[PDB]
Amino acid sequence: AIERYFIREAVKEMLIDEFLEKELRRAGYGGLDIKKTPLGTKVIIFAANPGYVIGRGGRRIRELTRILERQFGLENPQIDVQEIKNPYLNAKVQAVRIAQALERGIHFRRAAYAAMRAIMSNGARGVEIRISGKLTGERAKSVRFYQGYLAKVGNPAETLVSKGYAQALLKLGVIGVKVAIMPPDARLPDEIEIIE
């Protein structure tokens, strides 16, 4: 019935999003959006390097459209590429960037501090970064970096904080990266103001 219709559409978006996230990793993929028009489907993709997505004058956008129409159930797709709105307030993007920096060969302390400095500079109330894996030896370890205000437990922490996770594949194994960010406009329940 009607429920089967809603669930069917939700799964398509999840599969497409996971496929694109795995595919457009070097381009700083940052989510997508699907709109339905009488002519077909408008598919908007957010990325930081649109040139990689386009791929030297087409030859990649056409392939993506063909894959979307064939492998997935999209009918008459049309792909538009835009720019990420607030790159320093999206936890997923920052997590992937830190993972790539680790894969390059930077020491994890420098990467973490650089990311925290940039994020706090762009006007965020608080940030927390956690890195786990075989850092400096064969016995696993976890380290945590933090500064600012950050909620962790309760409903506000569920609906206000942005969270992201990523894997970094090094020579010795994988390294897990977690990032949490609080936007500048977040207001906690106990922040009341007196009208003058």
């Binding site: 329940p189 106990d190 009341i192 103001e193 007196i194 009208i195």
Partner: protein, 64 residues
């Protein structure tokens, strides 16, 4: 236990000094005044603040 919360007491004390001649020993009047003078949205928090303000008024009027 019915222990009043810190920020409730803080905001209540701030309101009391700002407009001393604005609250009475009546709960309804204080409730409406607290509703109009702040950006509080939770119906529970408003009641807590109004109650504490009423206690403050009746306590200062007595002279402690």
């Amino acid at each position: 236990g019915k222990i009043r919360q810190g920020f409730i007491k803080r905001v209540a004390r701030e309101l009391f000094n700002k407009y001393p001649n604005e609250f009475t020993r009546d709960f309804e009047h204080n409730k409406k005044k607290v509703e109009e003078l702040t950006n509080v949205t939770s119906k529970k928090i408003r009641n807590r603040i109004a109650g504490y303000i009423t206690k403050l008024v009746r306590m200062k009027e007595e002279g402690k």
